[PDB]
C-alpha cells in the first residue's frame, strides 16, 4: 500500500530530525539548519498529499478513511511538536 508507506517514511523522517535536534542542542550548522528547514517543508507538503489521497478516495468502498485520517492527524501533531522544538531551539544561543 503506497499511502501506508509514505505515512511510515514521514514518521521516520520526523524522528530522524528529532534525534538530530536532541544530539546537537546547539543551533549552529547553517547547513543543517537549512537542510532541516528544507525537509520540514517537504513534510508539510507530503501531508497535503496524504490528505488529498483521502479526499479523492472517499468513494472507494474498501478504504478506511477514518483510520487513515487518524494517522494523518497523528503526523500533523508530530510535525507540530517538532516545529516547536526547532523554534524554541533557535532562540537558544549561537
Amino acid at each position: 500500500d503506497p499511502f501506508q508507506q509514505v505515512v511510515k517514511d514521514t514518521k521516520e523522517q520526523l524522528n530522524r530530525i528529532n534525534n538530530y535536534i536532541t544530539r546537537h542542542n546547539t543551533a549552529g550548522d547553517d547547513d543543517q539548519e537549512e537542510e532541516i528547514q528544507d525537509i520540514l517543508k517537504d513534510v508539510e507538503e507530503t501531508i497535503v498529499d496524504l490528505d488529498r489521497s483521502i479526499i479523492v478516495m472517499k468513494r472507494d468502498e474498501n478504504e478506511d478513511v477514518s483510520g487513515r485520517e487518524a494517522q494523518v492527524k497523528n503526523i500533523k501533531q508530530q510535525l507540530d511538536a517538532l516545529k516547536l522544538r526547532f523554534d524554541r531551539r533557535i532562540q537558544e544561543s549561537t
Binding site: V6, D9, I36
Partner: peptide, 23 residues
Amino acid sequence: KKSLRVSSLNKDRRLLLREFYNL
C-alpha cells in the same frame, strides 16, 4: 559530514501520487 534525509521517501511519494487518478 552528516545526513538527515530518508532513503525511498521521494520514490514512495511518487507511487502515492501516481495512484491519485486510478478509478
